[PDB]
Ligand binder design. Structure first.
Ligand SMILES: Nc1ncnc2c1ncn2[C@@H]1O[C@H](COP(=O)(O)OP(=O)(O)OP(=O)(O)O)[C@@H](O)[C@H]1O
Ligand SMILES: Nc1ncnc2c1ncn2[C@@H]1O[C@H](COP(=O)(O)OP(=O)(O)O)[C@@H](O)[C@H]1O
Ligand SMILES: Nc1ncnc2c1ncn2[C@@H]1O[C@H](COP(=O)(O)OP(=O)(O)O)[C@@H](O)[C@H]1O
Ligand SMILES: [Mg+2]
Ligand SMILES: [Mg+2]
Ligand SMILES: [Mg+2]
Lengths: 483, 40, 469, 53, 469, 128, 160, 128, 28
């Protein structure tokens, strides 16, 4: 009867419905099918409307009635999502009833302009020795986690989320950071382990999980990162700070490619659409640091990219590297050796190594950066007696950069473990025993010497008194360790 | 082409860079000692 | 309702209806044929016309030939009676032993297990193979993937695992012959009747066979993977059993999809593949998993086109696997069997928390010295071993002994190899490689380590070689 | 000792050049295989693009 | 005249006019919108219908929505009111400082200056950077290019030139944020207020601002460079004075075109680019130049995908430039900043007749030893430094010192390095490298020449290194 | 005809490389998605259905057999090319032939290392 | 600089002198300059004679200056002249094609312009059949034979 | 014009590389079939017919001449690229210029080993 | 390189012979 606010399906195949009618429908508008499934109107053509199907399209037959929602695609937002696990559209999928969201933010909003933004100041503590020291992430920054399959990409994100328990359980309001893990492509079993891991570490109570797995259709995998970004912008605008992890944007692009190609849009490089740079640029740009006038909040992004055989020069990897503020090159070569996390220090950069580091960390990190840089120049050997001990330092410091899973360290604790290596209390000690050394050393210092760690956090630096205390602790510990 | 070995970035390139760095570290120490002599 | 065939181009067939247009996924019975032909609906083209994919050869089809609608997808038999029987893509028996009589049926298409239904318990699976258990050990109720090029050793490796694991395991099993040799189906069928895992007279069979080999058309090879998958689902869900799924080869599911995507009227993706390569695999692979009630341990053989792992088909599967086993040709051509690449194969259970701190430390030590040995190949090629440093000679020596100690005689390989197959326990494997890394067998030769079980038999083999004078 | 090292360095560098020659030959074949593959792949993208118009 | 929308696919929009059909490159105002949405006509499809490109998000647009023809292209504010103010690609302000009340406007599309209007007055422009002023010095009233890969120091390099040249420059300047980070746009806007080049309370602003960052669509980013240079045309033509035109990044102009090339109905060219590359660049590039009336001195930052200089986008741009500054990653990874390639960066003014024989002979002498240094590195890789002769050891020593003396700390990049910025005069650079080539710094170490201003500070730093050791 | 009627036959395809090129012509003229080396998606299916027809029938089905000896032409010894690897993944082993051994004088120039027979070891006289 | 034309003229001369068969030279897609050089060298040598009817060579040319369609079927034009001497007169004919690569790319150019999806390395789909239908005509029949010396330019020194 | 009136002429195309890009753009927008590197099928014929016109006439046809000095821009010194190989195969020799020789001091940077002139060796003064 | 494997295998075959000589004389 009606063709203004209603339409009929001309053809349906591969999750792409061509709808006759829907004359008043908007671009990127959500539409409901007769079966109950929803869809998005992307292609508006003279004689039809190209609609992508959110989910299985076996129920959508020819001549089915397609209604209008009369609103652009949006997702629920707020603090109620913290704890719950949801899909791309924002529906509950963990069997704990329907969550009650207050507001509903749009998925495809523009990123904040030049005036509302302000330079990054406060730090985003990951709790990883190698990251916080050498590649310091500040709040509002976008830091790429790039590397091959099975090289500790997702592991870095998990340890970052668990590290925020130190701040979120405390009284300090500004230092809190709410996490948002977006899963794109990866299978449900993998995601189920991540939630189980975060649940056991008491991390889920301040974390949101947007699950778009391989079983889900391409539009859901395409939309999921934008849906999660909107959930993070709620905090960004309203004073609070947030953290989002796109794991991963490579598998998103594959869905966008499929979605685009089935809409009869011509291919480009490696069969990808022409605007795959625009896909990731507008998503990442939304992560920023808002000034005091607009709120003072922020949104920190951590995109993930899967390189094939260490080919960072490939099409999609080269796009995301130019977008993000920095990148962390993870490598199989270091990963197989034993260096986990396998963060390449020489190649990885943050591009904001000043405000992102604490004044206490800046002392030990600045000197460690220099020694490792000089070490990697004169590395390929194992003679001059002067530079003989220099090659040792690098091997000793590299063993300290090793770090076990699900155990993020505090900013004050990371300074203590570096203090031993940087001042030269591990030079005579054997390289193989440093993992055992640091294990006992860290557990000992945290157990008894709490006031020393507290004084570093209080003063915000390595004071002359605190420097003298550590000097006597490491020497006595080293003597006890050897003999 | 000239300098094609280091452009590749392999075993010979990295070992050549390390060789130069070692040699000129030793010569840098000797030259700093020469500055000690001329100053004193 | 009756339907008329309007277009036939290869495996793809278009059927038009007057009223009662069938939905997607539904099977359609083509009338006026001697053998039972089946068309699965894929798309709705418009004008009461639907695009379909034929599960058998489309030769002999005329335009206007009547096609009936079954009113459902391809429904197949599932139960205890499927054990010891060979099924085809559309459920029929292809072993000449009458029909498969069951009290319930199941469609080949179904939604994957929901997020709440997923399991968390990750327990280790001991194979017996040294290179596997040390570097990339498999897990019980997981998803094992055997990558390998043309003739590297996937079908031998999968048969070793079936011989060892599936024999010594109180539970049912499933083998899915997807687009591989029909000769190998005949060999496997008789070998299992011989052993006892399949029994003709008795009803005590452990294995369920499903076959859609490389002689079948693309429609069969694209859907036969799901047919064997559906058999494993029954035992998982409705019984709550520990099932072992063996798909050889899973690549053929994707390859068959590429052959039809051209004819379905889609724009091709990278390397001529279908644009729905990830999603078609996604909906399939997600069903193969361990739920809360039951459990499935899938061991999938994966073909690698032109020895290229960056190819879309093998590249996509990596994410769907827990443990990977990358079989290299360069390793196989050197004589090292099984040719598992120690700096490529990976596993998610490889963690000091799960396998232990001693396992993880010894695991990285093997990979470390192998990486250092590989880094000096350019130096040994041009200059030589004499140009290397004195301490570097020691690192190259042990790595080659470690490479040869990773090799192992196989049980199924006895027939052509001659050497008796070995089955090394976990604790003996870790002990063996740890002694070589520490330098407890630097005086012994390399060829002593080549093709032996535990470290004890390597030392005894060196004494045998010592008796050439 | 002088005549021994010159005879050894002669053959050592002779082997280095001959070993290098073999690696160049095999890399030249791998180069030409990858050369053709790039020409074919890039062309298929253009044909894929034109057909979709 | 009225025109209704008939189709919308991505950034591309098709509008059908009833009678009055608009020419190509005309601004179309879309009615019934909260924010302003300009559409530019690219093609005439026929049947009184035209294809356009959106300057902002196309979400919300409906088929049958009314669109009015402005009767002219995208016209923007031009004059002294634009100074110290940020604006869109379409012309509207986005710094929250009210409307930009200009007395005269100007269209972003215009015919380039003819052959007769071209000048040939070559004159050297002293910036302050040693590697630039020595090897590839910029031309006063010329076209400067800054080629570089991902994170090799393009933004740091161009932002230094703004800090150094604009202060000494007694005139005006223009900056264009074409498809780059909005974070950088935030960092630039605030620091220019601190330096005092853009004053707030009074109208004494030197620099103008145009922006269209990578959060914008393709149609926007494809027209920002045109919007940016159109401002510089006003300060060239109307006011008989000099002007600076900084752009970052100009690659995004050519990229943005290829994002809508497929949707406009074009067969794609090599490496995924549009076939209209040289012509679309040509009509834009030649507008940015010095006429006989005025003088634009442009500084264009050019992105080089995957450090690939053979890529179509950067390769085509070389023909449009007089002076070039090619940035290498291999040089950047050593610690040499700015990472300028001395055997690649060149300029048209590098001639003994133009810049004097002393300038030419020294610059060529630096490039001679650095080129021979590459040949010796191939010999050192097999032999080593010790086996080389006395002559070749000295050449390498002088070469390594010259490499490090080309590096220099910037005032804009203080937080990155830690040391204070420098600005070396012209004649200090020519004489500084001449003393090194002559052999008057053999006794000093190479570390003293790393990251310093003139040759005096290299001698002064050697005193500190002696006392510390 | 021989296989099914209790007789034994040998068949030699010389060569399937030139057949694949001829089928590529048909596919490229028909305008279908070209993959590796411009070959269609079903170039594997082309050779797979052909070779499987070669088989050994049991006594119930006459007891005959068809033995296949397909041929492939490699380019500069590229064993890991697209079409060669497809026929290697179908056949029950292969016989690699070296250009070096053939030019050097060793004829037939069979590569002992790479050449293998899977089911032939069982069907061999004990004297051998 | 290797006596290429001298070798060609001698083969033309000796086959005519010994076996008593005429020769045919097919200029395909090379330089017209080179055709001018060869034409006059043949006159100075003697294989072509303007004064009397004792010439041993029949020249057929279709060089760079002519379009793809013209260059594509020059080898066929020359081949047909050689076919006469074989089939009708029963001789041992000597054909020359220079360059044979030009026949290939001409066929590739024609296939591209006609609107056909290119095969591997941009060549035509009908690479084998176009070469096959031409080359198979050059054979020994029971009446005579045509032995063809074909100049091959290997692109990028790649035999594969 | 000069050639056909007994006078000598010299033409310099600077450059034929950018001509192909313009010709490519023109053909692709007319929806003509694309070829290798997106260039149209007859991209060789483009430069071949252009260069063939350059010639040396005999006394009977005026005795004039038209000398052609075309220019090509290589990528990283790759003489075996698509467009360069076409123009190299047309001309009567070439003058190869390296970037290495330029910076070393050799200017003009003419690679004597690769640069050759087949026809012009005869057309030269005996003094030289 | 094939001759890389040739030189390496030659070296370790010689050293394997030396190790078997020491092993047999120690065994006696
Ligand atoms: N620091 C570490 N110590 C010990 N094990 C680690 C460490 N980092 C990573 N691993 C191991 O590596 C495995 C893979 O890591 P991760 O889950 O990050 O994979 P990925 O790189 O994200 O790629 P994918 O998710 O596709 O497998 C994990 O199962 C984990 O056990
Ligand atoms: N464990 C092993 N030991 C020795 N040889 C093996 C082993 N596994 C495989 N092979 C060899 O590899 C060949 C091919 O094995 P197969 O599993 O059929 O490879 P694919 O399945 O990759 O085609 C066999 O003929 C056999 O000789
Ligand atoms: N002059 C310089 N001195 C020291 N470091 C620099 C300099 N220029 C760039 N860098 C390094 O590069 C990064 C900034 O590069 P950037 O200018 O953003 O390059 P691009 O604009 O090409 O991305 C910083 O992290 C810094 O460490
Ligand atoms: Mg991951
Ligand atoms: Mg197999
Ligand atoms: Mg930049």
């Amino acid at each position: 009867v009606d063709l203004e606010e209603t339409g009929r399906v001309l053809s349906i195949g591969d999750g792409i419905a061509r709808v006759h009618g829907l004359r008043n429908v908007q671009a990127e508008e959500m539409v409901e099918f007769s079966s109950g499934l929803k869809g998005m109107s992307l292609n508006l053509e003279p004689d039809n409307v190209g609609v992508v199907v959110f989910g299985n399209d076996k129920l959508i037959k020819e001549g089915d009635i397609v209604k209008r929602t009369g609103a652009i695609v949006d997702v629920p937002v707020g603090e109620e999502l913290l704890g719950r696990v949801v899909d791309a559209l924002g529906n509950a999928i963990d069997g704990k009833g329907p969550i009650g969201s207050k507001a509903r933010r749009r998925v495809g909003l523009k990123a904040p302009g030049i005036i509302p933004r302000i330079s990054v100041r406060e730090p985003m503590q990951t709790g990883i020795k190698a990251v916080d020291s050498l590649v310091p992430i500040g709040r509002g920054q976008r830091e790429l986690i790039i590397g091959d399959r099975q090289t500790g990409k997702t592991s870095i994100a998990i340890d970052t989320i668990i590290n925020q328990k130190r701040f979120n359980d405390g009284t300090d309001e500004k230092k809190k950071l709410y996490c948002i893990y977006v899963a794109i492509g990866q299978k449900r079993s993998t995601v189920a382990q991540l939630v189980k891991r975060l649940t056991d570490a008491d991390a889920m109570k301040y974390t949101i999980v947007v699950s778009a797995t391989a079983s889900d259709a391409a539009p859901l995998q395409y939309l999921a990162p934008y849906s999660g970004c909107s959930m993070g912008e709620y905090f960004r605008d309203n004073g609070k700070h947030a953290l989002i992890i796109y794991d991963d944007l490579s598998k998103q692009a594959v869905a966008y490619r499929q979605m685009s190609l089935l809409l009869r849009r011509p291919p480009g490089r490696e069969a990808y659409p022409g605007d795959v740079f625009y896909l990731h640029s507008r998503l990442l740009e939304r992560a920023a640091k808002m000034n005091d006038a607009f709120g003072g909040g922020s949104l920190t992004a951590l995109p993930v990219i899967e390189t094939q055989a260490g080919d960072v020069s490939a099409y999609i990897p080269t796009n995301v590297i130019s977008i993000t503020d920095g990148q962390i090159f993870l490598e199989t070569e270091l990963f197989y050796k034993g260096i986990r996390p396998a963060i390449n220090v020489g190649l990885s950069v943050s591009r904001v190594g000043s405000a992102a580091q604490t004044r206490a960390m800046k002392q030990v990190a600045g000197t460690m950066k220099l020694e490792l840089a000089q070490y990697r120049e004169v590395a390929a050997f194992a003679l001059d007696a002067a530079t003989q001990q220099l090659l040792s330092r690098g091997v000793r410091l590299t063993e300290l950069l090793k770090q076990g899973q699900y155990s993020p360290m505090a900013i004050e604790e990371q300074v203590a473990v570096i203090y031993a290596g940087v001042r030269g209390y591990l030079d005579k000690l054997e390289p193989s025993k440093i993992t055992k050394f640091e294990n006992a050393f860290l557990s000992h210092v945290i157990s008894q010497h709490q006031a020393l760690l507290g004084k570093i956090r209080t003063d915000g630096k390595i004071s002359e008194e605190s420097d003298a205390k550590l000097k006597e602790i490491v020497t006595n510990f080293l003597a006890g360790f050897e003999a | 082409s000239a300098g094609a070995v280091r452009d590749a970035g392999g075993a010979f390139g990295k070992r050549e860079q390390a060789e130069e760095e070692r040699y000129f570290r030793a010569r840098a120490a000797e030259q700093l000692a020469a500055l000690k002599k001329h100053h004193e | 309702t009756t339907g008329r065939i309007v277009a036939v181009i290869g495996a793809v067939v278009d059927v038009q209806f007057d009223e009662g247009l069938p939905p997607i996924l539904n099977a359609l019975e083509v009338q006026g044929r001697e053998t039972r032909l089946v068309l699965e609906v894929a798309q709705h083209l418009g004008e009461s016309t639907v695009r379909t994919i034929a599960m058998d050869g489309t030769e002999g089809l005329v335009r206007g030939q009547k096609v009936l609608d079954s009113g459902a997808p391809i429904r197949i038999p599932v139960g205890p009676e499927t054990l010891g029987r060979i099924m085809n893509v559309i459920g029929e028996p292809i072993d000449e032993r009458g029909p498969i009589k069951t009290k319930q049926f199941a469609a080949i298409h179904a939604e994957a297990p929901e997020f709440v239904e997923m399991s968390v318990e990750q327990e280790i699976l001991v194979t017996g193979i040294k290179v596997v258990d040390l570097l990339a050990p498999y897990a019980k109720g997981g998803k094992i993937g055997l990558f390998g090029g043309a003739g590297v050793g996937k079908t031998v490796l999968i048969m070793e695992l079936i011989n060892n694991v599936a024999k010594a395991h109180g539970g049912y099993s499933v083998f899915a012959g997807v687009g591989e040799r029909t000769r190998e189906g005949n060999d496997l069928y008789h070998e299992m009747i011989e052993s006892g895992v399949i029994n003709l007279k008795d009803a005590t069979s452990k294995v369920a066979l499903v076959y859609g080999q490389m002689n079948e058309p693309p429609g069969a090879r694209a859907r036969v993977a799901l047919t064997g998958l559906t058999v494993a689902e029954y035992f998982r869900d409705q019984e709550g059993q520990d099932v072992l799924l063996f798909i050889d080869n899973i690549f053929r599911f994707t390859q068959a999809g590429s052959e039809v995507s051209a004819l379905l009227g889609r724009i091709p993706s990278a390397v001529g593949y279908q644009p729905t390569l990830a999603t078609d695999m996604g909906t399939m692979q997600e069903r193969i998993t361990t739920t809360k009630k039951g459990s499935i341990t899938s061991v999938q053989a994966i073909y690698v086109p032109a020895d290229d792992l960056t190819d879309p088909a093998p590249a996509t599967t990596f994410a769907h696997l827990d443990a990977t086993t990358v079989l290299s040709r360069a390793i196989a051509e050197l004589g090292i069997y099984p040719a598992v690449d120690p700096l490529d194969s990976t596993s998610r259970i490889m963690d000091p928390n799960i396998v232990g701190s001693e396992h993880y430390d010894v695991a990285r030590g093997v990979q470390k010295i192998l990486q250092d040995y590989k880094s000096l190949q350019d130096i040994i090629a041009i200059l030589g071993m004499d140009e290397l440093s004195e301490e570097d000679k020691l690192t190259v020596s042990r790595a080659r002994k470690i490479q040869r100690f990773l090799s192992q005689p196989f049980q199924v390989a006895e027939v052509f190899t001659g050497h008796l197959g070995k089955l090394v326990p976990l604790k003996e494997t870790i002990k063996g490689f740890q002694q070589i890394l520490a330098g407890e067998y630097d005086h012994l030769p390399e060829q002593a380590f080549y093709m032996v079980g535990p470290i004890e038999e390597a030392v005894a083999k060196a004494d045998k070689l010592a008796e050439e004078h | 000792s002088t005549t021994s090292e010159q005879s050894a360095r002669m053959t050592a560098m002779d082997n280095a050049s001959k070993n290098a020659s073999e690696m160049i030959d095999k890399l030249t074949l791998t180069f030409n295989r990858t050369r053709q593959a790039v020409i074919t792949k890039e062309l298929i993208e253009i044909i894929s693009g034109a057909a979709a118009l």
